[PDB]
Structures are given as C-alpha cells and as structure tokens.
Amino acid sequence: TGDQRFGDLVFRQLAPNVWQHTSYLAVASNGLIVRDGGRVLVVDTAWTDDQTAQILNWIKQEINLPVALAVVTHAHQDKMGGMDALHAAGIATYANALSNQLAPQEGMVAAQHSLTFAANGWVEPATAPNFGPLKVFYPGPGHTSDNITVGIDGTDIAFGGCLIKDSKAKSLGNLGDADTEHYAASARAFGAAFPKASMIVMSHSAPDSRAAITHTARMADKLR
Ligand SMILES: [Ca+2]
Ligand SMILES: [Ca+2]
Ligand SMILES: [Cl-]
Ligand SMILES: [Cl-]
Ligand SMILES: [Zn+2]
Ligand SMILES: [Zn+2]
Known part of the structure; x- marks a missing residue:
C-alpha cells in the first residue's frame, strides 16, 4: 500500500504535503497532517493522548518541521480525545466556540482558541489567524451541532x-x-463550500470521491 505504521498509528500520504493519520479504539478514526512551507498543521487528535503523542513523534521523524497549530472538528473522543497531548507539546489548538462550550459536557478538554462562523458557514477570519491553506467551514448541525469541516x-x-x-x-x-x-442540508452545504474538491476525507472510512457527500445526504434525507 505504501502506508506507514508508527506505534499504534497508521499514516497514508494523500498528496505531496498532505497525510491521513489513522488511530484505533478496533474502530478507526482519521484526521489530517498538512505541511505548509516550514511548518505543519494538524486536523483532529487521535482517540487518546498517547496515540496523539505518537502522531507528533511520527511528524518529527518523517517531516521534521514544527507543528504550528491543530484544528479539531467537534467535541467527541475520536476528534478531541488527545487535547492534553497537544497542549503538553505546545501546539496551539483551535475548535468551534460551540465545541469548546460543549467540551466539558462531552468529557473533552477544550481547545485554547475558539473559531466563530458567519451565517453562511465560513469562519470569521480573525478567529483563524495564520491558518495557511486551511479553509474552515461550519456546514450546520448534523453528526453533532458543533461539527466543522x-x-x-x-x-x-x-x-x-x-x-x-x-x-x-x-x-x-x-x-x-x-x-x-x-443533517441532509448540512452535508450538502459541505459539498457546496468545497465545490472543486475531488478527494473527500472522513473520519471512519478511507478517502472517497464526491459521491460520499451526495450519498450521505441521500441517507440523511430519510431521517426528516
Ligand atoms: Ca486527557
Ligand atoms: Ca454526548
Ligand atoms: Cl499537496
Ligand atoms: Cl473547492
Ligand atoms: Zn462525533
Ligand atoms: Zn466519529
């Protein structure tokens, strides 16, 4: 495959400067690692602090650039279980304000910084300083009320x-x-926010095409 294992973690290169991290609780959860010039940006923790430290050590070994920040995509264990490890390593953390507000109720440690969003879903840019290529979009309530993309x-x-x-x-x-x-409208809003994206990465399956978006929305239509 070309996948690399480090400890309990699996890494897959998706593009020259993008990798998927996969950790297991065994249920897989995926996040991203992005090389942005002379620094690295992380999307999502692993399920646990120990697993999240393994991500950081893989980055040091294989990329050897400082990790400037992490953005975490909602207040559940698969996405925020490793916040203490990020903070211990000195990585600035960002989450939806609503994720940070829900975090204690969901058993998660809040991020240091809160992202806020316009009515159209796009992050208010002063809340996402120096995010490089990361474009953060709140599609509306779906999997949770706080989920971001x-x-x-x-x-x-x-x-x-x-x-x-x-x-x-x-x-x-x-x-x-x-x-x-x-949920259905939120799935469709994600698709509309990133209309040219052809590789859709998600938490619990391998990367897919845009078909994942329209299929997700079709399933969600049946919940209303
Ligand atoms: Ca912890
Ligand atoms: Ca809950
Ligand atoms: Cl790239
Ligand atoms: Cl796009
Ligand atoms: Zn969740
Ligand atoms: Zn999940």
Whole structure:
C-alpha cells in the first residue's frame, strides 16, 4: 500500500504535503497532517493522548518541521480525545466556540482558541489567524451541532470529519448527538463550500470521491 505504521498509528500520504493519520479504539478514526512551507498543521487528535503523542513523534521523524497549530472538528473522543497531548507539546489548538462550550459536557478538554462562523458557514477570519491553506467551514448541525469541516487550499482535498460517510455506507453511524432534521442540508452545504474538491476525507472510512457527500445526504434525507 505504501502506508506507514508508527506505534499504534497508521499514516497514508494523500498528496505531496498532505497525510491521513489513522488511530484505533478496533474502530478507526482519521484526521489530517498538512505541511505548509516550514511548518505543519494538524486536523483532529487521535482517540487518546498517547496515540496523539505518537502522531507528533511520527511528524518529527518523517517531516521534521514544527507543528504550528491543530484544528479539531467537534467535541467527541475520536476528534478531541488527545487535547492534553497537544497542549503538553505546545501546539496551539483551535475548535468551534460551540465545541469548546460543549467540551466539558462531552468529557473533552477544550481547545485554547475558539473559531466563530458567519451565517453562511465560513469562519470569521480573525478567529483563524495564520491558518495557511486551511479553509474552515461550519456546514450546520448534523453528526453533532458543533461539527466543522476543513478544505486544503491548493489541493483536491476536503475533510468532512464525522459528518460524511462513505458512498457505500448502510447508515449514518453514531446519531446519538445528531440533528436528524438538518443533517441532509448540512452535508450538502459541505459539498457546496468545497465545490472543486475531488478527494473527500472522513473520519471512519478511507478517502472517497464526491459521491460520499451526495450519498450521505441521500441517507440523511430519510431521517426528516
Ligand atoms: Ca486527557
Ligand atoms: Ca454526548
Ligand atoms: Cl499537496
Ligand atoms: Cl473547492
Ligand atoms: Zn462525533
Ligand atoms: Zn466519529
């Protein structure tokens, strides 16, 4: 495959400057690593602090550039379970304000900084300083009320996190915290935000085409 293992973590290169990190609780969860010139940016923690430290040490070994910041895509264990490891390593952390507000209730450690969003879903840019190619979009409530998404400018890649399921999926997975009414529109809004992205990365399946977006929305239509 060309995948690399480091400890409990698996890494897959998606583009010259983009890798997928995969950690396991065994249920896989995926996030991203982005090389932006002389620094690295992370999207999502692993499930645990130990696994998240393994991400950081793989970065040091294989890329050897400082990790400037991390953005985490909602307040659940697969995305924010490793916040203490990021803070211990001195990595500035960012999440939706609503994720930070929900974090204690969800058993997560809040990020240091809060992202806020316009009515059209786009991040208010002063809340996302020096984000380089990361384009942060809040598509509306779906998998959770706080779920956010990230496009990588200059690439074909957009990250749907746990909102988006793969195009062969039989269900929308864990709907315990979901907004079943608004989910379909939120999935479609993600697609519209990143209209040229052709590789859709998501939390619990391998990267897919845009078919994942329209399939997710079709399944979500049946919840309303
Ligand atoms: Ca912890
Ligand atoms: Ca919950
Ligand atoms: Cl790239
Ligand atoms: Cl796009
Ligand atoms: Zn979740
Ligand atoms: Zn998830």
